[PDB]
Design a protein around this nucleic acid. Structure first.
Lengths: 116, 441, 441
DNA sequence: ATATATATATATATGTGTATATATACACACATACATATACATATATATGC
DNA sequence: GCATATATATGTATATGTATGTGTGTATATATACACATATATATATATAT
């Protein structure tokens, strides 16, 4: 939901001002979607593909899916804010054609965009 | 303290593409074989888990929404009880799978009911269509307690209409008539000429006519007099308030018509007096077409099929019959697999029944008896016997009233019943059992 | 058709009186025993319903809210899950009733989130204070599937803070401290002079000053300098939002204060720079009185004790020690009932075990012979024996691995094991087991 | 020299999702305050009194 | 030229009577605003033509 819908729409909103992108002041915070108990310790997985690549290699567990911060606990939030992880968002030189290709009202862009 | 440069193209190609394919398969478009959404599979899977005890008990729609995350739902549940609320009607769907309890609605109210008032149970239609669901294909996710897809004997998606809408893609199928789809899959069984099924919408006393891809869903009116008229059926895309605010309210503001309620038990009844400003032709055909266009009793519709196969990708069909025969061939293959598996289990339960019958016949009369010995060496002594082997664990935990001679014959006669079921299911095929499945209706 | 005159005295003194009765006795009040309102009794009752299978699995609040109407609930489930959200705090409650998993707020925020992100399960402290629940007094209504109340060793009404509000009456009780109430029920068990427990708040560094039937809950503050200010604790009825909105903002738009945040591991850390046109008193006691008058760090609270008893009727009290003593004298009768009933069943169990052990000692080359004879013959000949008077159904439901020597000694040692349990629960009384279940903290 | 034939992007709208909020009754028995006014003491002063 | 006296005006400090709570959740219902697209529809803007 978040990183697929409110992320690229607000990046298309932010595309009017690239100066804060080359100032490096926009920082995405990578957030976990699965917290898994293995043995005693926990493991964090940010996206579903990160879990699904490492699902078979990891042993028997008890997972908890994370829908958002409402399922995250106190110590988990204090760890991810006092030791945060940022993606630095850099606009390319062809940001306008990407934002028109992915945010324009033509559905055909979304048709052969997914066909590759 | 991590900082990584993140470019927009790989952002698109990972997560926007993931959002696109997620909206395609896991949010909007059902699989072509059974016609269920994944959230809809969660709804009927929770219906199975709720009605494991009794079929006839009525569960709350909050109860069908309650324990959903343990079966693999991970998203907003409010869409799950609203999707459950948009299926158990008698009026939007020809073919319900859930008996309702409460005002789920009629055609006169388009709104679904709340999650605080209506009970529901599963219908008999689940026990008419959806069979051998222990042989459903296991989903790749272990957390996915519902299967990869369910097991229908019919193309269900044609029976109630599905509007799927996702990232750059659209699809719409429309409801049909039960005997038309029934004779269509009867012809598709026998390799005959398959007729495209007749379109039926429930609680609709008008008709739907197919004109060059367009479908015209017709509202009905009748001349009460020269200036008086009665609308008796309207198209379903207009509700009561929608026909009022889209037709009737933008006709009394201009002083054209005058309307009042006459909604009987059949449905959408209105009575309209034509004013003197709204003039009508003497010839009835252009007057009829003028009234038919002005009152909006035409519902135009267009079709789109972008549906999902069993291989996890898209497939576009032009018509109904190709999807029908693809359903027929995949149903023939999986019914052949399930009867081969039944052969495997029918011979296993034969082997266990003959083993327990011969074991009881030697326990009653023979040297095979237990008397203050060591359970373990007794089980090893049974493990010496080749046809007492691999069944020793439940034999020590087996009751003493089989030791009476009333049940020593009973085990034998039930083994004979297994015999007749074993070489009864050694001779059956796909086509006669699925013929039995179609004549169950 | 019944055109009946229903007069207003009849309307009030039947219908509104029953509505008032429902508010005062089945909506608002917690009993002095369990400390639970009936919707709380519904919440922990369905928590026990979903506690089976594992005591460490986490469950959805909507999974409780689904089938709460099975137990006799006939209202909206949203109030029930918000009630369970309050008992999911462990900051508004000193005593943790349920272990939880999700975002539950802090001191600084009070509105709990919706059910859609929240997992809950039974806490261990339930099992510390609630035990032996099959002896709970079954409610007079048949579809009231939970009992009247449950079995705590403690009055839980005084542990977490009760505001009880209904038609006419109102009541309020502050929380307390675990060691204080533990030594209080020691001293009230022993019959000595009973000490008042200390009122405790969780996660809270303020001070409760007890003067003239009056509780002054005092937030903390410190003069870091003459002008610069640090309030570290605010009183308990206020959170960070209303301390900003009703204290920090109205003095901030008057040219006297400029507030900022300095929180941390503890909340409510406000660093306030006073302005130069606001007077700092060199009289420090006048400074203290004026900072109490303006900043409002002293919250004064008066309790109110009206309760429904064990008999179902209203009782007005003024002291908490009388509630402890009433709890003890009410509880000891049902403890003695449990002791006598437990003696009855433990004896029935010992005579059952000795009967089945001496049965098996009369089967293994014994006079009780099973082969060659039918079911009815053995049921009649064991029914004529007085020491198999009414047990022969589970003798016949018994299976053949109760034939060896090792099981015969097992039945003998388990018969003498529940014999010594029979004598051990036969000797004891109320007081020493109440001491034991108190010291199992 | 404006009437009309016609063409094309406006308005729902469908279902799915994903998230908000809001008016009220309940009642004590105080809690904080909202001004608030009000009556009375005393000060000075000035203008009378001498 | 100076005693003086009392008068009223304004601090002031308390004590009145109200006024607003919201308390703290339970309880009842309802509303909100967005993203995903084709399919009509409609309505009015321009050309032309005599």
């Amino acid at each position: 939901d978040g990183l697929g819908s409110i992320y690229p729409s607000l990046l298309g909103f932010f595309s009017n001002w690239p100066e804060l992108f080359e100032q490096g002041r926009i920082r995405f915070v990578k957030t976990p979607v699965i917290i898994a108990h293995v043995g005693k310790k926990q493991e964090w997985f940010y996206t579903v593909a990160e879990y699904e690549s490492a699902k078979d290699a990891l042993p028997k567990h008890s997972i908890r899916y994370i829908k958002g911060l409402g399922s995250l606990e106190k110590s988990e939030y204090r760890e991810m804010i006092q030791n945060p992880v940022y993606d630095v968002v850099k606009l390319p030189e062809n940001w306008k054609e990407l934002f028109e290709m992915l945010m324009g009202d033509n559905a055909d862009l979304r048709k052969e965009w997914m066909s590759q | 303290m991590q900082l990584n440069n993140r470019d927009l193209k790989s952002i698109i190609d990972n997560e926007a593409l993931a959002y696109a394919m997620y909206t395609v398969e896991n949010r909007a478009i059902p699989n072509m074989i059974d016609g269920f959404k994944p959230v809809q599979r969660f709804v009927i899977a929770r219906a199975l888990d709720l009605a494991r005890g009794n079929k006839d008990k009525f569960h709350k729609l909050a109860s069908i929404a309650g324990g959903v995350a343990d079966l693999g739902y991970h998203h907003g549940e409010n869409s799950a009880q609203d999707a459950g609320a948009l299926m158990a009607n008698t009026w939007n769907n020809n073919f319900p799978l859930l008996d309702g309890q409460g005002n789920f609605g009629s055609r006169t109210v388009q709104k679904a009911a709340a999650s605080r008032y209506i009970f529901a149970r599963v219908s008999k239609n689940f026990y008419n269509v959806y069979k051998d669901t222990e042989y459903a294909p296991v989903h790749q996710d272990k957390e996915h307690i519902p299967p990869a897809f369910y097991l229908p004997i019919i193309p269900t998606v044609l029976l109630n209409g599905v509007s799927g809408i996702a990232t750059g893609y659209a699809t719409y199928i429309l409801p049909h008539s039960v005997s038309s789809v029934k004779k269509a899959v009867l012809q598709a069984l026998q390799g005959k000429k398959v007729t495209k099924p007749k379109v039926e919408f429930p609680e609709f006393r008008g008709e739907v006519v197919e004109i060059d891809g367009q479908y015209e869903i017709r509202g009905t009116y009748k001349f009460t007099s020269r200036t008086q008229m009665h609308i008796t059926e309207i198209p379903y895309k207009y509700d009561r308030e929608t026909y009022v605010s889209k037709i009737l309210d933008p006709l009394e503001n201009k002083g054209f018509i005058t309307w009042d309620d006459a909604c009987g038990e059949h449905g959408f009844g209105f009575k309209v007096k034509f004013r003197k400003e709204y003039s009508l032709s003497d010839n009835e055909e252009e007057r009829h077409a003028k009234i038919m266009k002005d009152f909006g009793l035409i519902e135009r519709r267009s079709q789109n099929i972008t549906v999902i196969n069993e291989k996890g990708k898209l497939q576009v069909y032009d018509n109904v019959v190709d999807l029908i025969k693809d359903f027929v061939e995949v149903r023939k293959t999986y019914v052949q697999k399930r009867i081969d598996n039944k052969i495997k289990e029918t011979e296993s339960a034969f082997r266990l029944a003959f083993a327990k019958a011969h074991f009881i016949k030697k326990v009653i009369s023979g040297e095979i008896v237990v008397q203050g010995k060591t359970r373990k060496e007794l089980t090893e002594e049974l493990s010496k016997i080749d046809m007492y082997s691999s069944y020793v664990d439940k034999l020590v935990g087996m009751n003493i009233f089989h030791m009476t001679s009333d049940e020593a014959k009973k085990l034998a006669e039930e083994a004979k019943a297994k015999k007749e079921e074993n070489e009864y299911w050694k001779t059956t095929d796909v086509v006669t059992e699925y013929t039995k499945d179609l004549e169950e209706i």
